[PDB]
Each structure stands twice: as C-alpha cells, then as structure tokens.
Curated annotation (Swiss-Prot), chain B:
Reactions listed under catalytic activity: Hydrolysis of terminal, non-reducing beta-D-glucosyl residues with release of beta-D-glucose
Pathway connected to this protein: Glycan metabolism; cellulose degradation
Single GO molecular function: beta-glucosidase activity
GO terms classed as biological process: cellulose catabolic process
Organism: Aspergillus aculeatus
InterPro entries referenced in this protein's UniProt entry, alphabetically: Cellulose_deg_GH3, Fn3-like, Glyco_hydro_3_AS, Glyco_hydro_3_C, Glyco_hydro_3_C_sf, Glyco_hydro_3_N, Glyco_hydro_3_N_sf, Glycoside_hydrolase_SF
Presence of the UniProt keyword rRNA-binding in the record: no
The protein's name in its UniProt record: Beta-glucosidase 1
Family membership noted in the UniProt record: Belongs to the glycosyl hydrolase 3 family.
Keyword terms, alphabetized: Carbohydrate metabolism, Cellulose degradation, Glycoprotein, Glycosidase, Hydrolase, Polysaccharide degradation, Signal
Amino acid sequence: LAFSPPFYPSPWANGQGEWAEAYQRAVAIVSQMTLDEKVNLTTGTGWELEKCVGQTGGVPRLNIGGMCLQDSPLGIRDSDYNSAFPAGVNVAATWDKNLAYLRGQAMGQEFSDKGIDVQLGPAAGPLGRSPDGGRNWEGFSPDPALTGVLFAETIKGIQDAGVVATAKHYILNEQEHFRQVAEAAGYGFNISDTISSNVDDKTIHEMYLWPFADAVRAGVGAIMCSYNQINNSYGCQNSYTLNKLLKAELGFQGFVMSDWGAHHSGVGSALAGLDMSMPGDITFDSATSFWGTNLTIAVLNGTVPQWRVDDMAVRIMAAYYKVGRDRLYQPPNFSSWTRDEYGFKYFYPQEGPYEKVNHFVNVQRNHSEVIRKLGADSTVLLKNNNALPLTGKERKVAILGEDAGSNSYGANGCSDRGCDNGTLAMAWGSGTAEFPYLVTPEQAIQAEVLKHKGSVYAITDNWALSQVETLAKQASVSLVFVNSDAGEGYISVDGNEGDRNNLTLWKNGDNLIKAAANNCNNTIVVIHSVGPVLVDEWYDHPNVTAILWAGLPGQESGNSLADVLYGRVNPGAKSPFTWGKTREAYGDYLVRELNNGNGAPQDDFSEGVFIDYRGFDKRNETPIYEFGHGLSYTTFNYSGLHIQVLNATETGAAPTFGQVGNASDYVYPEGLTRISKFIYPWLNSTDLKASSGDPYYGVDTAEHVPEGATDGSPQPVLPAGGGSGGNPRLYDELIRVSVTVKNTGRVAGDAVPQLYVSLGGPNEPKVVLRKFDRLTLKPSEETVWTTTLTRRDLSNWDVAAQDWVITSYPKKVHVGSSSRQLPLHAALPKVQ
Amino acid sequence: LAFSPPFYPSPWANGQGEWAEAYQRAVAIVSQMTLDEKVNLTTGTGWELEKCVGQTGGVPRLNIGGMCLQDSPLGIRDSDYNSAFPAGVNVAATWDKNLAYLRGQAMGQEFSDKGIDVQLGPAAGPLGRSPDGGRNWEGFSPDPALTGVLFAETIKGIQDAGVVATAKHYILNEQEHFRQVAEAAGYGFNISDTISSNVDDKTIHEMYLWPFADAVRAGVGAIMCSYNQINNSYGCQNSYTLNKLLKAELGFQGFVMSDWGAHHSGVGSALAGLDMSMPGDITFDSATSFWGTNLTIAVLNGTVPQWRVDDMAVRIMAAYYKVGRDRLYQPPNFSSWTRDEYGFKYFYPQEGPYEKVNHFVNVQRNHSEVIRKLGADSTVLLKNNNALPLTGKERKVAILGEDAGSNSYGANGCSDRGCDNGTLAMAWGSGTAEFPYLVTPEQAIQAEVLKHKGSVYAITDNWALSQVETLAKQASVSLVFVNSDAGEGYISVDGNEGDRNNLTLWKNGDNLIKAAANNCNNTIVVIHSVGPVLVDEWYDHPNVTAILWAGLPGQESGNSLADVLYGRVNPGAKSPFTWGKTREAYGDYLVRELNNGNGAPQDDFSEGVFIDYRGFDKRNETPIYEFGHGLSYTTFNYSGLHIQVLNVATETGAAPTFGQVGNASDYVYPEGLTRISKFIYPWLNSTDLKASSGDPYYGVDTAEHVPEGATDGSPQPVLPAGGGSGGNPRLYDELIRVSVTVKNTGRVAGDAVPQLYVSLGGPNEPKVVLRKFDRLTLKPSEETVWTTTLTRRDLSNWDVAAQDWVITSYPKKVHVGSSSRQLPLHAALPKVQ
Ligand SMILES: *[C@@H]1O[C@H](CO)[C@@H](O[C@@H]2O[C@H](CO)[C@@H](O[C@@H]3O[C@H](CO[C@H]4O[C@H](CO[C@H]5O[C@H](CO)[C@@H](O)[C@H](O)[C@@H]5O[C@H]5O[C@H](CO)[C@@H](O)[C@H](O)[C@@H]5O)[C@@H](O)[C@H](O[C@H]5O[C@H](CO)[C@@H](O)[C@H](O)[C@@H]5O[C@H]5O[C@H](CO)[C@@H](O)[C@H](O)[C@@H]5O)[C@@H]4O)[C@@H](O)[C@H](O[C@H]4O[C@H](CO)[C@@H](O)[C@H](O)[C@@H]4O[C@H]4O[C@H](CO)[C@@H](O)[C@H](O)[C@@H]4O)[C@@H]3O)[C@H](O)[C@H]2NC(C)=O)[C@H](O)[C@H]1NC(C)=O
Ligand SMILES: *[C@@H]1O[C@H](CO)[C@@H](O[C@@H]2O[C@H](CO)[C@@H](O[C@@H]3O[C@H](CO[C@H]4O[C@H](CO)[C@@H](O)[C@H](O)[C@@H]4O)[C@@H](O)[C@H](O[C@H]4O[C@H](CO)[C@@H](O)[C@H](O)[C@@H]4O[C@H]4O[C@H](CO)[C@@H](O)[C@H](O)[C@@H]4O[C@H]4O[C@H](CO)[C@@H](O)[C@H](O)[C@@H]4O)[C@@H]3O)[C@H](O)[C@H]2NC(C)=O)[C@H](O)[C@H]1NC(C)=O
Ligand SMILES: *[C@@H]1O[C@H](CO)[C@@H](O[C@@H]2O[C@H](CO)[C@@H](O[C@@H]3O[C@H](CO[C@H]4O[C@H](CO)[C@@H](O)[C@H](O)[C@@H]4O)[C@@H](O)[C@H](O[C@H]4O[C@H](CO)[C@@H](O)[C@H](O)[C@@H]4O[C@H]4O[C@H](CO)[C@@H](O)[C@H](O)[C@@H]4O[C@H]4O[C@H](CO)[C@@H](O)[C@H](O)[C@@H]4O)[C@@H]3O)[C@H](O)[C@H]2NC(C)=O)[C@H](O)[C@H]1NC(C)=O
Ligand SMILES: *[C@@H]1O[C@H](CO)[C@@H](O[C@@H]2O[C@H](CO)[C@@H](O[C@@H]3O[C@H](CO[C@H]4O[C@H](CO[C@H]5O[C@H](CO)[C@@H](O)[C@H](O)[C@@H]5O[C@H]5O[C@H](CO)[C@@H](O)[C@H](O)[C@@H]5O)[C@@H](O)[C@H](O)[C@@H]4O)[C@@H](O)[C@H](O[C@H]4O[C@H](CO)[C@@H](O)[C@H](O)[C@@H]4O)[C@@H]3O)[C@H](O)[C@H]2NC(C)=O)[C@H](O)[C@H]1NC(C)=O
Ligand SMILES: *[C@@H]1O[C@H](CO)[C@@H](O)[C@H](O)[C@H]1NC(C)=O
C-alpha cells in the first residue's frame, strides 16, 4: 500500500513577506491569552450551534468575536438577499484576471456585510483530473497555470474586501466516490477509511500543488484540508502535504482548517499541521471534539507542546488581521439554519435566549451587473457558421429545451440545488448560494424578440418532440438548450452520486437537438454544464449552425446569454478544458468500485501529469474543441514573435507566547450554563483522564507521536522553500516574450493570446500553458503583448534534489489562439 | 314532446333601412347569374378542399372570388402571424362599448389582410344559461342587455373594417353535451338526434333572442344557426327561429349559414330559411351535399321555388357588398391545413396544381397595444384590503401556481388549446387562434420586480406545496395564480367534455391558495377562467388580501395583469356574471344523461328568464360577488337621480325572381373540367334528375314533406313586432331620459361603470334587470352627469297573446348604482306607452 512519509516538526509562523505586520499583531494579542482562549480560536462550537456553517467561540475577554466561516466559492450559502455568482469554471472560461478579481471583490463585500469573517472558497482542488469529477466546476481548469492565476486573483479580490479567503480543498480530492465513509455506506459500500489519492512527488508539484503555491504567494489567509487520504494518511493530518509541502516548502503563514468531518484525531492532526477543527465536533452534534477540551488537556499533559497551540492561535489571528477583519467585525446577522426573524440563539438544541437571528440585510448592491457581464464573458462560442450574432429581425424564434425554462419548484426549490430542472445556472452541494432570482434564457430571449415585434415560443419538455419538430419547421432560428449537471457527493440526482455517471447531455438532450436540426436549417445549441459533454453525435450536423457553452452563469443567466446572442457582447471566452470525442479519450477513470476489500479504495494517479489536454496531446488524439478554443465575432492575427534574455538557511526556535497554568485554571467556570452539544475548551475537573473521556487516554502515547513532532529547535529551510509560494529565486524573470496582436475583423472584442512552452525530455507534455491575457482591440487596432517566463515556468520538479531545476533538454515557446493553433514558435536560449 | 310550429314562407330580402344600396347591387349582379352560379354562392366546397375553414366556389364568370369564412371570435384560427385577442367574456367584463368596437376593428383588419371575407364571430349564443356551459366564454354575459350592446359594437368594428361578421350560434345552444350525434357516440352515448332546447316564447324573446335583435339592428351581414334542436326541430332548418323570429320579426336582411355538420336536409332547410351550407358536404369529405347538385335539382324539379334560391344569392351578395368586401377582395393568402409555404392547391385529396399555399403575411400591426389595454381593462378587482396596487418596493415576491407559468409544450403546443397547462390565456375548441407569443404572468411580474431590484421567484407545480409554504413564509407578497378551463365539446380535457364538470379551481388551486395564505399575511389571488369559480373556501381567509379575475386575456396576459397590479391601470372592470357560494345556487343544471331513451335528449328551460343574477335575486340568495361588482383604486359617489318623460309597412311585396332558369342540360358538368376528389359542385351528372341526385328519397311523398305555405311567393302580412331592423322601429323610440351625477371621490384617476337597472313589475318578473351602463373616466374630485334613455323595448315585456312587446300596467322603477346589489338611487317611473 502507498505510504505517506513523516515530516515534523510542524513549522511555526515567522512574519514572512507581506505577513510581517499581521504576525506582530497576532503575537501581541495571543501573548495575552490563556490556554483555554487559544483553544477557543482553533475549535468550532458544534454543528448548527450558532449562525454560520463553521463558527468558533472567539475570545470575548479580549474583544475577539467568534469567527464565522461560510460557504460558498460562488456566493453566500444558506442566507438571504445575497447574489448568486457564476461558478469558478465560468471564471476559468473568461481567461480574465481582472474579472476573477472583481468577482472576488464583489463576493467579499457581500460576505463581509453579513458579519462573515472567512469565505470558504475559492477552490482549485479538485483541479479536474477526470472530466466526470463531481466538483471540478467549483474550481477553475485542469490546467495548473490557468487555474493558479485566476485562483490567486479571486483570493486577492475577496481579501482586499476584508474577508479571509480559504483555498480549498487541499489536496488531491479529485473524485466524490468514497470520499467519506458514512457517505459511501449510504450508497451501499462498506469502507473502513476514505479513498486514498496516491500520487508521485513530481506530479503533485507540477500539477496539483502549483495553484496552491500561487494562492500562498497571493497572501491567502486559510487553507481547508480535504476528506480523502493521500498515500493512506488523511488530508487533515497528513504531515507530508501540510507540514512539508504547504508550510515548509510553500512557506504558508495562515491557518489550515478541516473540511466538515475531515478531522480524524486530536494529537495526531495538531502535530501534523492542522490549525482549526470544523465544525468542531467529532461527528455532527456528537457533543464531543478531537480538540476543544481534548486540545486543552493535550497541552496540560505534555503531549502537544505549547508552541504548537500558540502557533495555531497566531496563524489564525494573523490571517484575521491581515485582511483587516477587526476593523469590519460584526456578529453574523443571519442564520444558516432558518429564515425566521426570531429563533433560539443556539439552533440545534433550541437553547439560549429567544431573540432575533435574521436581520434580512440586503448585501446585493449592484452586483447583478458584474454577474451579467461575467456570464456573457464566459460564454464560449465553440462553432459559428456565420449564424451569430442575431439581428433581432428573425421573424419566428423557437426556444427549445427544458434548460431554457424555469425550475417549476422555484429557482431555490431544490435543497442545495440537488436537482436538474429548468435552466442549469448553478450545480449542487455545499458549493452553492440561494438565488435572489433567476433570469432564464426563455425570459431574456422572448423579451428581446418581443422588443423587435417578432413571434417567439418556448418548448421546455424534452420528450415533447412532436411539438419541437412542428415548431422547428416554422422557425427562422431554433435556439436549443441542453445541460449536464453534477455536484458534491452527499447528494445524488438520477443516480449520479456527486460525480457524473457519463458525459452525455441530460434530459434527452441529443434527441432534442436532432429533432430541432432535422427540421430547421438554423439551429443553434446552447449548453449549460459543469464541464465537457460529448457533442459528437450532432456537432457537425449541417443544420447546427452555432454551438455555445455558457457553464453555470448564476442569477443573470438569460441576460448574459442574450447579450452574446444579440451582439451586445462579442464573446471572448475560451474553453478551459478539452472537448473529446468519447469518454475514453480523456483516460483518467474515476474509482467506482472497491479495489482494496473493505479497506480504503486506492486511487493511483498513474497517468502522472497527463490529464485533460496534456493526455490528449501525448496520445495524439484530436479533440473536437481543444483547450483554449473559442470563437469571436471578429478575427485576430498574431505575428512578430520576439524573445529577450533578461539580466535564510535555518528557522528560529519555536516561540511560546503567554503562560499555561494548572488544570484547575481550565475547569468550566462556575456561573456558566453549558448549552447542549456546544463544544467548549474547558475540563470537567482537574482529573485529565476523566475530563477527556478518551478510551485511548494516556496509552502508548509516545509510540503514537512521530519522531520530531515535538521538536521546537531551529529547523533547516528546504532548498525549494524560504519564500512565499516557494524559494524567491523561482520567481526571477529569465526571458521576455512579445508578439503583436491585431484585430483584423469588423467588431471590437477581446483576444486571449496564449503562450505555451515545451520543456523537453521524454516524459514532458508536448506543450504546457504558461502565460495568457485578455486584450481588448477595436477593429484594425493592434497592440504588443509582452510577458515574462520565470525560473519556475521553465523548471521541472527533481525528486533527487527536492527542488525545481531547469533541465538541460532544449525548450521552445509557442504563441497563438489555442493549444492547437500556435502559429508562432521559437527555440528558447539556454538560461538557468 | 316539445313541438316547433311551422312558419312559411321564408321571408325574402327587401332592402330594409341601411341595406338599401347593398340590396340594389346584389339584385343587379344576381340577375346576371345562371342557376348553377347562384347555387355555388350557397354551398361550401367540402371539408379542407380549399384554404379557409369554410369556403364557397364563387362565381368566376362574374369575377366573384370564392367566399372565405374563418374562425374565430377572438382572432384568426389556423393561420400565422396573427394576433390572439382576449375572449369575448373579457370584453363583457370591460363594460366598455368603445373597447368592444376597437377589438372588432383590429380583428376585422387582420382577417381582411389575410384574404378572409367572413369572420365567424362574434358570439352571443350560448348566452350563458348554465355557469358550467363549455362555450359561454366565447360570448359575453348571461345578461341580454350587456351582451347585446357589446355584441353589436363588436360587429360594427369588424364590418367597418371591411369583413362580414357572423352573429353565432343561433340559437339556444346552451351546452356542449349531446350537441352532435357522432360526438356524443365518441363519448359512449347513443342518441338519434341532437339535444333539443325547449323554451317558451316569452323567455326566448326576453333573453336569448335579444342580443340577436341588437346584432341585426347594428347591421350584421351573416348569422350562423346552431347544432342543437329547438323544440325538436334542428337549428339550421327551424322555420320558427329562422323564418319567423330572425327573418320576419327581427327583419334580418343578410344570410344564414349552417354550423359545420349542422346542415341536415336540402329541401327542408332551404324552405325553412337557411341560406348557406358549411363546410358544404353532408359529413366531412363525404363527397355528397344536401345542396350543391341537389339544390340545382331541387329548383329544376319544381320543389324549391326559384325565388327562394334567388333570395339566398341576394342575401349573400348583399352582406358582401354591405361591408365593401368587393373593394378589398383577395384570395386567402394562407392555408388553414398546413403551414408549408408550397402545397397542392386542394388539400384534402392533395390534388390540383402544386403552388404557393402560404405567403406568411404579418397582419398583426400594433394590435398587441389594444390587446394589452383590453386585458388590463377586463381584470376585475373582486377584493382589495388595501393590498393593491403594489409599489415595486416589496422586498420578496412569491409568484405561485402553474397558471403563472409557461405551457411546457409552447404557447400553441396543444392543438386548438386543448389542455390547461401553464397560464390560461385562451380556452379550447374552434373559437381559438394561434398565439404569435404569450407573455406569462411569471415573465411580466418577475421583470417588474427586477426593475426595482427586488427578489422574486415562481413556483409552477401546484403539488409542490412544501416549496410553496417555505417560500410564502419568506415573501412580502404572494401572488397566487389559479384557473378553470372549458371549451367546445369535440375536445375533452381531464374528462371535461367541453362543458366543465364542476366550478372548482383546476390543478389543486384551492389547496395552493391555502398553502400560501396560511403562511403569508399578504396573499393575493389571480384567477384566469372561462367563467365563475367557487371561491367560498378561501375568499374570506384573513390573509387573502386581494382577489382578481382576469378572464382569458390573450397574448399580452402577463403585461395586462402587471399594468393593473402595479397601478399603471386602475381596474375599472365589473363582473359580467354572478360568483355564487355553490354550484346549486345558480340552478340551471346541464343535461348530462340520456333522458329520452336513445332519442334526442330533452333540455327544458324550465327556469324561464331566471338565469345568473335574475335567479339569485328571485331566490333571495346572496352571491359572494354579484353581477356588476368590481373595485377600483379610487371610490365613486352617485347622486342626483332625475327622470324626464320624452316626446311601417303592413304587407311585404311578392317574392321576386332575378334571372332565368333553363333546361337540366344547361347544368350538366362542363365537359372540359377536371372534377377534384371530394370537391362539392353545383352540377348534374346527366339530365336525369333522379339519377343525378343520388338521393334515396328522390320524389318520395314530396308534397307531404313540403310544409304548407313553404312555396307561397305572395305578399305576406308584416308581424306586429316586425317591420324594422331588430324589430318594429317604434320599439326604439326613446320614452324616458335618466340622468345622475357620478363623482370620483378618492385620490387617483379611474373609470366608473354606472349601471342602470329597471324593475318592470309583475309577479313573475325579475326584481331588477340591467338596461344601460357606460364607462366614464374621472380625475380625483371630478364630477360628470351621466345621461341615458330608456326605449319602448327597454320598458316592455313580450306578450305571447299579442305577439308583440307591451309595456304592462305594473308600476316600473329605475335604480342606478355600482352593481346589481349596490343601488343607492331609485325613482318611480311615470306611465308611458
Ligand atoms: C494527553 O491528552 C491527549 C488528549 O486526550 C491524549 O491523546 C490521545 O492519545 C492517544 C495515544 O495515547 C491517541 O490514540 C492513538 O491514536 C493513534 C492515532 O490515530 C489516528 O491516526 C492514525 C494514523 O496514525 C499515523 O498518522 C498520524 C498522523 O496522521 C500519526 O500521529 C500517528 O503516529 C501515525 O503515524 C504513523 O503513520 C504515518 C503515515 O500514515 C507516518 O507518517 C508516521 O511516521 C507513522 O509511521 C489513524 O489511522 C487513526 O484512524 C482511526 O481513528 C479514526 C477516528 O479517530 C477513524 O476515523 C479511522 O478509521 C481509524 O479507525 C480505526 O482505529 C481506531 C483507533 O485509532 C479504532 O478506534 C477504530 O475502530 C478503527 O479501528 C486516527 O486518525 C492510533 O493509531 C492509536 O491506535 C493504535 O494503537 C492502539 C494501541 O496503542 C490499538 O489499540 C489501536 O487499534 C491502534 O492500533 C493500530 O495501529 C497500530 C499502529 O500504530 C498498530 O500496531 C495496530 O496493529 C493497529 O493497526 C490510538 O488510538 C488519541 O488519538 C489521542 N486523543 C486525542 C483527543 O488526541 C494523550 O494520550 C494524553 N497524554 C498522556 C501523556 O496521557
Ligand atoms: C469560548 O467561546 C465560547 C462561545 O462564544 C464562550 O462562551 C460564552 O462566554 C460568555 C462569557 O464570555 C457567556 O456569556 C454569558 O452569557 C449569559 C447569557 O446571556 C444571555 O442571557 C442573559 C440573561 O437572561 C441576557 O442578559 C444576555 O444579554 C444574554 O442574552 C450571561 O447571563 C452572562 O452574564 C454574566 O456574566 C457577564 C460577564 O461575563 C456579566 O457582565 C453579566 O452581568 C452576568 O454576570 C453575572 O453572572 C456572572 C457569571 O455567570 C457572575 O460572575 C456575575 O457576578 C453575575 O452574577 C450575578 O448574576 C448571576 C445570574 O445572572 C447570579 O447567578 C449571581 O449570583 C449574581 O447575582 C454572560 O454574559 C456565554 O453564555 C457563553 N456562550 C455559551 C454558548 O456558553 C467562552 O467564554 C469562550 N471561552 C474562552 C475561554 O474565551
Ligand atoms: C363553382 O365554383 C367552383 C370552384 O371555384 C368553380 O370551379 C372552378 O372553375 C374554374 C373556372 O372554370 C376552373 O378553372 C379552370 O381551371 C383549369 C386549371 O387551372 C389551373 O391549372 C392549370 C393547369 O396546370 C394552370 O395552367 C392554370 O393557370 C391553373 O393553375 C384551367 O385550365 C382552365 O382555364 C381556362 O379557361 C378560362 C376561362 O375560364 C380562361 O380564362 C383561362 O385562360 C383558360 O383558358 C383556356 O381554356 C379555355 C377552355 O375553357 C379556352 O377557351 C381559352 O381560349 C384557353 O384556351 C387555351 O388553353 C386551353 C386550356 O389549356 C386549351 O385547352 C385550349 O385549346 C387553348 O389552347 C380554368 O381556369 C377550376 O378548375 C374549377 N375548380 C375546381 C376545383 O374544379 C366553378 O366554375 C363554379 N361554378 C360556377 C357555375 O360558377
Ligand atoms: C447518462 O446519464 C444520464 C443522467 O443520469 C442518464 O439519463 C437518464 O436516462 C434514462 C434512461 O434513458 C432516462 O429515463 C427515461 O426517461 C424517459 C422520459 O421520461 C420522462 O418523460 C416521459 C415522456 O413524456 C412525454 O409523454 C408524457 C405522457 O406519457 C407527457 O406527459 C410528457 O409531457 C411528454 O409528452 C410528449 O409525448 C407524448 C407522447 O409520448 C405526447 O402526447 C405529448 O403531447 C408530448 O409530445 C414521461 O412519461 C416520464 O414519466 C418522464 O417525465 C422515460 O420515457 C423512459 O421510459 C422508457 O423506459 C422505461 C423504463 O426505463 C419504460 O418504463 C418505458 O416503457 C420507456 O420505453 C425512462 O424513464 C432519464 O430520464 C435520464 N435522466 C436524465 C436526468 O436525463 C443516461 O441514461 C445516461 N446515459 C448513458 C449512455 O448511460
Ligand atoms: C356522378 O358521376 C360521378 C363520376 O362518375 C360518379 O362517381 C358519382 O358517383 C355520380 N353521382 C351520382 C349521384 O350518381
């Protein structure tokens, strides 16, 4: 079985780079705290005990309010009068750093105005190993450069708005099946521990870890560790991924929190680099915690050093001060668990004072404008045989497909969006928000048609093919809507347990398109989906005259689409994944059956870096629509490639901050009423064993604490660490590349130039993306696009050196409009 | 068994009143015709043989194109790029003569621009005897005065736009059950003939005939006779209703056409007053006709007098010239039977040249604006506890009910509207049109809320009550949409065979309303329906803060409603029928079982004139919402009622003939002519009349089957009640002027609908009967004097001994006010005669 080697001790924060100020303030405040106050910072108060999906108790003596952590990466979850933004995969399709940032900002503002201190997003894990993974749509793209940049911009947007962002899920949570034992049991499978992602050291560095290096470097304040194991050690106590890769090598200064039920031990996780337990209890409402009381006892009894808990408290406070949260603090002014105005203060046990729990604060501002724009700028025009834009003069318009229409249960009518009914604007699970409303394609396109005095209808039953065919025969243009949905693994829709069972259009989508195209010579297909779908059966039908993929557009869906179809917005989006002819063309099969008896299923990432386009390229398979493909209402020319060559070894000892007293200091205080199921930091009595209630208390302790796990002395700095997101020399700029881009067509719009490198060597992909931008040019206008390649951009990870090295194989650079349209290339000069 | 006495001969046209000129042109052109040409005008060419749902062959030698007849009373049926107008019941609810006129003009324009000569509408039969009748919605109101006035304005709108209107269905077709023998068989009922409406002479004069008098007097060119029998004589050969009441008493100068399959004999129908056979064959595509060949033969063999067929020709051409159709003539430029651009000329057999059958002409103009306004102006505000209008500042708006949402098969996705899916904007059957689009309440309300930056959702599955209750608990206002549908009898939706099986909301509507009102203190109910529904279980819920009935609004439905809800239009509409506590409170049960063995079911109108509010008032039963009731966003005051007393041939000419009839050999099929399969022609196979007729009863007991007087072309007496248009002209003398002051006493501009009722007195007269109304726009504080006049007809009763209208000696009173139960002003009327 794959094995996860140890790396200890858990590195302590040190004020690195842009953290210096936040760190000194954290140390100043944590130095005033008692042990039970520190522990209150690290442990949630119990599932549904307070307002937010995650909430800690804070430190009231020092005026630090409990920290409220809320989903999702696309808008506030379980709340009211908030916006519902396009999913992260739509951000990836924009290839637009500025939009990623603005969406970040607009979300952080909404969260902040609800009294939420930490947003649980953005996501870059799953990166998107498999096309049918149930949660890729929450993240960005299976390409690490594209994902890393937009993930970092999203983070900066959210944090500049005063809310701590949480880069999740760390790491290798690439499929929903078998991610949690109790879930798998509900789906008929008996496993003793969750699926283990087994991954070699080079692949993890070059693919899955790279966007987390970007997030660290961009200043992200929190990381959420994952439910799956990595080489059979759970994500939230994997000393190699958390202590070595995240903290020692990437130099992460913020705090790591568990996913909800991902916490699996007290001492083991604390020493393997976890900082925050969510939602705080061992299972929901168990009234027990691996930390809380137990972490106070673990320090008192000598097993967890004081420097470890002190460092947890310092990382947590520093992330809070780093985004300025203290200046914006207010208690959460809504409840995740009810929409009632009044309720008991502590929801799950219905205890505490009966008082106002919801204030109905409308935090939307004018964010519907950035949503509508981001939806239009993420609508990829995959095919256009001279059909779009429409003029508004088409005499009779057929709107065809359930995906154009309303959810008959209401837009929020399926809990956590766990159904596929009506237009698909948001996929399912915890990665969701309540729509304030949902503009459907039927609404926006019919309103556009009626504004020009046209005739228009919508057919939204995909088995009503008799009606579809009759109307398609009468129409000037048929706009056909289809979808494919997926989501987090605790919800199953039509037998898809989070992950998609296939890549085919749902609700009869292929038969619908053929019914319409067989009968109307101007049939235009619009796809809303979580990821790629198979288009092979109809994409080259001679009456399918255009095809668009609009992703998961959020609340302004129909308006974002009508803007594109009627030429108000010239589509500039590019596919952020590959569109293959078959499911087999992508390889990388999900693990769907137990392969390790009733032990943890074993998920070997045996393709290495070869996922999405790298895998297609290596197999010489031609995609229908490649990574980076998308059309425009204008054309662009790329010419004139120009290349120019450009000109701590030990840590401190672990500090302690403040003092730890006798057990009687930490016994429940006398006048306090303990709320049922509420998780506290306090002990029932000075008897440590009885107060822990742990059946393993004090047994074989030293044998269960890895070697080095308590060592507070100065540590070596890793060759690849020493900076933020890696050794700073990885970020030196070695080569400048420039090209001329001209708009040669007749419509103003945006080009997305893309720069790929060939690193060389028998095991390297043919091309890997490194740089891109999105540049606005009016007709005939030109501009020089210039960018630089960093030492990291030209390196591979070398397992013998434990460092990035520029290998001696000759390297090339390529510039053009997609991974398969690269008219400009050059050999790169040797650099090191 | 009820018996229908004979009245013969069938009166001939005479150029009465405004028909003088059209009649002179008709005689001049018909005087040039041969017998086979005249026959061609009276007979359709067979089901689906040409373009229009009925079409004659015309008279090509004299450049008279075939007449194209097309449904429906609310917009062009079976066509493209046309508008879908609100139903006739909505026009009733507007109480607005001007809107009725403007809707008739917008429709006539559209029909004319498609090459259609005759619109098959508007409808005042069924009048609305039973609240669950399947086609009341196509007509206006169970009240004869309200109906007759808006029917007449609708006809003047259509005809002033250059298309012949057809007043239908004449007469007493007050239910769909047992209306046609083959339809009844399709439903498991074995009957030998159609249901017989059996009605006394005074009720038919005072109720069902009255709007047809107004139609005739307003100039209607055509009348369509009905499928039912009346006293066991078929509506399209009933000499009493056709010859006596319509032609001799009301003085009708235009032509009578059959309903489709309502023609039941050649000789008998022609003598009893029918003028045109539709669609022309005996049964669809039977290639046989009671007329066509048979009518040419019936004149040749002496059974039907030449003057009778000359008169059919003269009435048909006169209706055509009267509206000026000859000046707008063009072949129908669409096909009812296919939307294809090209097709065989003759659809049913797929024969004739292969040529252009559709030109896709867009005839809609800006008719959406009159549709939008008439939908808003027909939305009756039944209850409003200071809930409406909305301001747009409502923070969260719940739109609840399938009736708010789209039809998942597309607006036209159910053939002839035969389903109740999504919002109900048009009921079912032949009285239908293709929507060019349909704006749903969901669309227009959600767009309104978004313009204000509110939050809004629509739940459109009426059994998703968990989601309904959860959203309603969150909502500032819950707008709940419910409906009840019905239509022509040839379609059955959910076991409703045209007629509605009950008056209860469809699709779980009562439960949906309770789910919302139990959870939301500001629940507003919007009803789309063909007629009244039972509101008793929830209308007085303390959380139901407003209730509206918006009828069947046609293609602008959601915009018409949003205009009212957000106060761009202050509702002025008034209920045109009564909302009772129970079905039993209306009486007037439909006949739903065979009650005459396997012969015609017998439908006795034993309540007489006591239908709708007359019945409630006679029984002292209190409606929840009375006839005439509607609220407004302002209030009106009525004061100062005052009354002021104000200051014909006896024989016809002899029946004329125009032009000549020759030998049988003149009428044999022309040798150079390809005879299209199923097409109906006027020609004879040979000079052998018996053989050419193919009639198994040819020459059988003929004299016995020709009623006494049926061939009598001599001068006839003029009936005491006849001699004018819509009756003896002395019936229209104005005898009393009434005036009252109407004031807007509230804070916003709005329309009042003052209503003038009379009590005619007598032990068996209704307590009150509507006679006058108008719809008057007033700004806040503004006052106006409303003046109208009562005619001699308005004060009379039908006296069956006299066969005339008489003002009886019981003292009469006038009552003016805002509804049939809210009449604060009353005056005794002085004796007048
Ligand atoms: C001061 O106060 C403190 C607070 O109260 C006291 O704290 C308690 O101390 C106890 C010890 O005194 C702790 O109990 C022991 O816990 C260990 C750790 O269990 C967790 O981690 C397991 C993985 O361990 C590796 O990885 C972590 C880091 O991730 C390391 O910390 C470990 O040292 C170990 O490292 C090796 O491996 C990694 C790579 O993976 C390398 O990198 C390293 O170099 C090392 O090689 C993990 O598997 C555990 O998962 C179980 O528990 C989860 C629920 O918690 C459950 O979800 C999982 O499915 C799994 O369930 C199964 O096992 C549990 C029992 O652990 C059963 O109850 C359950 O039925 C299932 O069987 C977990 O997340 C734990 O291993 C110990 O248990 C082993 O040993 C005891 C005997 O001593 C046996 O009785 C047990 O069966 C078990 O035996 C297995 O393991 C042995 C290998 O070690 C092997 O020999 C056996 O054959 C068998 O395979 C103890 O349970 C307790 O956690 C802690 N409490 C709190 C609140 O923190 C403290 O004691 C006190 N101090 C003093 C001085 O008084
Ligand atoms: C870890 O995080 C957790 C979660 O956030 C922290 O747990 C919370 O800690 C709070 C203390 O910081 C504790 O707050 C208490 O709440 C009680 C309930 O308050 C609500 O109800 C009351 C009463 O109806 C309303 O007034 C109030 O506004 C709330 O709606 C309060 O009643 C407690 O008030 C008392 O203490 C505060 C100061 O803490 C005083 O200012 C206040 O006057 C009260 O003082 C009396 O009681 C205290 C001790 O209870 C005595 O010391 C004092 O002398 C007074 O005693 C008189 O009155 C009491 C009865 O009231 C009488 O018995 C006595 O004989 C005297 O006559 C306080 O406000 C939260 O409840 C608690 N949350 C939960 C879920 O448990 C935890 O602290 C964090 N841990 C660390 C280490 O940081
Ligand atoms: C009752 O109503 C019914 C239904 O409306 C009436 O029935 C219709 O009557 C029409 C009038 O007679 C009759 O029309 C005939 O249609 C034929 C076919 O028309 C179409 O297809 C052809 C063939 O592909 C196309 O070419 C044509 O354009 C149409 O698309 C025609 O072939 C007949 O046309 C001729 O006669 C008329 C006079 O009516 C001329 O004006 C016209 O120009 C044609 O003229 C030639 O034919 C006549 C012989 O009648 C000659 O006298 C003349 O000099 C021309 O001669 C040359 O050409 C002919 C024919 O090719 C040739 O044989 C000769 O030697 C010369 O070379 C005519 O148009 C409809 O078919 C019929 N509809 C149905 C469904 O049956 C009915 O009449 C009404 N009854 C009454 C009593 O009013
Ligand atoms: C990949 O992954 C996807 C996602 O998980 C998989 O998709 C599922 O595929 C299943 C297997 O194919 C799908 O299940 C099938 O669904 C069919 C349709 O179900 C729905 O629609 C029907 C038909 O509705 C019409 O008729 C109704 C009245 O009967 C009417 O109300 C409705 O409005 C429609 O009206 C039109 O049609 C009638 C005439 O038919 C006209 O009169 C009318 O005017 C209109 O024109 C409805 O009956 C049904 O209840 C439902 O709403 C079912 O039809 C399938 O049934 C066939 O097989 C049955 C058992 O399997 C058997 O009973 C029966 O005999 C049938 O032959 C079947 O349930 C499922 O929906 C898909 N799910 C999604 C989310 O898309 C996919 O399989 C995977 N692909 C691969 C390759 O693995
Ligand atoms: C008239 O002649 C046609 C053509 O032969 C024949 O088919 C039809 O049946 C005949 N009609 C009658 C009544 O005999």
